[PDB]
Amino acid sequence: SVKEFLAKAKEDFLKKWENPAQNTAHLDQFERIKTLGTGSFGRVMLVKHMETGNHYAMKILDKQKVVKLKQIEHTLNEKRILQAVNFPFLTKLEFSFKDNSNLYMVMEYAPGGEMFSHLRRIGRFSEPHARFYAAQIVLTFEYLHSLDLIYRDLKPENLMIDQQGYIKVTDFGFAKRVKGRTWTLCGTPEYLAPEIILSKGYNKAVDWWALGVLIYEMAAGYPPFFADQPIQIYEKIVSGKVRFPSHFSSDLKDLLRNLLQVDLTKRFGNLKNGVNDIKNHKWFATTDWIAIYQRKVEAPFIPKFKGPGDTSNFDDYEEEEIRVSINEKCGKEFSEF
């Protein structure tokens, strides 16, 4: 029973939600190996835990840059949620800690790289390939939403492939525990629901809209709404029109029409029957949900393996120092981290 697993999962989560783990390691316990990605307020590094020899992905956030970007509360959300959750297609938060300058989150390393990289290179995924990944997202959102969490940044850029070819959802910077509506304008332009663009209060339904975009982009090789500037994209998204490539199966077109539905009363995942409208759709008819959760079904693609700390499925970035100030920055702001 899905219901029973979820009840037990919510009991596990709440215990960790109400008493979050804190200061479970230190920088000097890790050997830093390579930058796997870098961006605005933080980067992600492959590191080695010296006491075990285990490889992890370590996300480093500059506290002062997080403050400048008004991402304090969102960053505390990220860490508080990641330490509390537990699901096969989520990247496990193994350790967290902070120093004078930085915040650190140590997660399980996914050596297969970003879905983004593989989707772009290959051009597009076949419907079975796309369906395999989509099922894992469907279950992850079912899990997350049952815990009153909204994810709010689904895209190929945020989905990692593991050694076995299964997904890990990463990047919880915008994840929030909310019962009811919330109003923050966040996410990625191509993936935003009409609600968000039109400054409405919105709910978890925006995650199921984002699923529609992902599936389309996986199967087409490009998103349903694109343009050179964000404003042009938002105009397309609010218009209520979408073209499907001629190669899209009848079932695929129908799943997407119901996912990319501007009308909340008709959007799949947001109806009386919840996520089962999606799980019971014809496109998923071949999907064995329990087998997917048990990671027993064979991946349509398994990444090139070349050792425990192979970074060859990731791009190269300039290595920049991890500098630790002699003065504590933003102590009050990040006290609970």
Partner: peptide
């Protein structure tokens, strides 16, 4: 083609989140 228009666009690289 739609593929060619996408590949010629400026949004085929990693896309940034929006904010304030």
């Amino acid at each position: 083609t739609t593929y060619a228009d996408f590949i010629a666009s400026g949004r085929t690289g990693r896309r940034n989140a929006i904010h304030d």
